[PDB]
Write a structure and sequence with these properties.
It comes from Brugia malayi. The chain is mostly beta strands and about 170 residues long. It is built from two helices and eight strands, in the order E-E-H-E-E-E-E-E-H-E.
Length: about 170
């Protein structure tokens, strides 16, 4: 409908792995998609609380779980403890209409009810047990293979890729 497309160009230890293209379901989750799109483009400015650029460029996929997902979006701390939304701080769970019924859905990472910031994860398997907990707002429509390459990278005891997985470029398409 009024669905938009966004991209992430990812490098693994400096070498380009490819492009992940995601379609945002703006019709089902307008605030959540708006937040994600603005973070991909950097067009909302600096975070109200952190004072840092609301932008994914240069941030990383700091967590990958074999057979399940890859997580990123922490542009303030790069380890899972940071991030901020374009609304200032965190925002509420918008909707639980869209579900983790397929692999490659894009979902909001969180630390409890209504704690959505900038961190997100892309699954590689259905995960209905995450329904009504994590807001699903998009799907990978191209570059699913880039997602799985990142997912199977060797990690340390904290699920962090040993390789530097960086979002080299990011923005909107269509």
């Amino acid at each position: 409908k009024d669905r938009r497309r966004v991209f992430l160009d990812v490098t693994i230890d400096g070498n380009l792995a490819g492009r992940i293209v995601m379609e945002l379901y703006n019709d089902i989750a307008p605030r959540t998609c708006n937040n994600f799109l603005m973070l991909c483009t950097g067009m909302a400015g600096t975070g109200k609380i952190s004072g840092k650029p609301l932008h994914y460029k240069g941030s990383t996929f700091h967590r990958v779980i074999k057979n399940f997902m890859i997580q990123g979006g922490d542009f303030t701390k790069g380890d899972g403890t940071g991030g901020e939304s374009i609304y200032g701080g965190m925002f509420d769970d918008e909707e639980f209409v869209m579900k983790h019924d397929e692999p490659f859905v894009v979902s909001m990472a969180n630390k409890g009810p209504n704690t959505n910031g900038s961190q997100f994860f892309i699954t590689t398997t259905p995960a209905p047990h995450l329904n009504n907990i994590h807001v699903v707002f998009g799907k990978v429509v191209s570059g699913q293979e880039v997602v799985t390459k990142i997912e199977y990278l060797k990690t340390n005891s904290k699920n962090r890729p040993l390789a530097d997985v960086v979002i080299l470029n990011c923005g909107e398409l269509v």
